[PDB]
Amino acid sequence: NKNYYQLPVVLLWVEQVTVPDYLAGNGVVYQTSDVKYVIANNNLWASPLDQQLRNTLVANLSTQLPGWVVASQPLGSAQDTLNVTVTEFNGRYDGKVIVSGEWLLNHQGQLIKRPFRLEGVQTQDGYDEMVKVLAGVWSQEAASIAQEIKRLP
């Protein structure tokens, strides 16, 4: 059978999330060696990964930022903007999942650029658990971004 996977979806405009080509295909990515990434043929994203990363980012930030309106749509001219590149979002042969990239926040004219690289541990086999753990780590990255925002005026 074919299986499809979704990162669960639980002023600030999350303008865009970019992924490179190898993460932009239909299949979920598994790193089988130190050099090789494989796109699954029968275990696919239920919608393109950059869209899922963007939507889950909006929802996770919304739960992390009470008093804020976080959206994937423009909200107002004075809004903060958040642009994210995700360069790694995959499982790995050693049971780990890797989530890394860089975000760029424009908060009232201040540009804040922060790299991120986080790891999770897959306690069960299968693409089910891999996607679960990746979603959890992505939510941790949203919490980190919201913590930086709450330290701003």
Numbering used by the authors: 22 to 31, 45 to 187
Q: Can you provide the manuscript's text about this entry?
A:
The E. coli Paraquat Inducible (Pqi) Pathway is a putative Gram-negative phospholipid transport system. The pathway comprises three components: an integral inner membrane protein (PqiA), a periplasmic spanning MCE family protein (PqiB) and an outer membrane lipoprotein (PqiC). PqiC is predicted to anchor within the periplasmic face of the OM and comprises an ABC auxiliary lipoprotein domain (formerly DUF330). Interactions between all complex components, including stoichiometry, remain uncharacterised; nevertheless, once assembled into their quaternary complex, the trio of Pqi proteins are anticipated to provide a continuous channel between the inner and outer membranes of diderms.
Consequently, we designed a second N-terminally truncated construct, in which residues 1–16 were replaced with a hexa-histidine tag and TEV protease recognition site, referred to as PqiC17-187, which was expressed cytoplasmically. After TEV cleavage of the N-terminal hexa-histidine tag, the sequence of PqiC17-187 differed from the native processed PqiC lipoprotein only by the removal of the N-terminally acylated Cysteine (C16). We therefore propose PqiC17-187 to purify as a monomeric species in contrast to the octameric oligomer of PqiC, implying multimerisation is dependent upon the N-terminal lipidated moiety. The PqiC17-187 structure, solved to 2.1 Å, displayed an arrangement unique to that observed in the PqiC structure with three copies present within the asymmetric unit. Two of these chains, chains A and B, sit in orientations similar to those of the two corresponding chains in the native PqiC asymmetric unit, however, the third chain, Chain C, sits perpendicular and slightly below the plane of the other two, interfacing with the bottom corner of chain A. Despite this global geometry change, the monomers from each structure align strongly yielding an RMSD of 0.568 Å across 151 pruned atom pairs and 0.591 Å across all 152 pairs. Whilst the density corresponding to the first residues of the β1-β2 loop region (residues 27–31) is more clearly resolved than in the full length PqiC structure, the electron density for the extremity of the loop (residues 32–44) was mostly absent from the 2mFo – DFc map contoured at 1 sigma preventing modelling of this region. Despite this, the electron density corresponding with the core of the protein was a considerable improvement over that of the full length PqiC structure with side chain information clearly defined in both β-sheet and α-helical regions. Overall, our PqiC17-187 structure provided us with high-resolution side chain information throughout PqiC, with the exception of the β1-β2 loop region, confirming the conformation of key residues of interest lining the octameric pore. Consequently, PqiC17-187 monomers are able to adopt a conformation more favourable for crystal packing thus, the molecules within the unit cell no longer assemble an octameric structure.
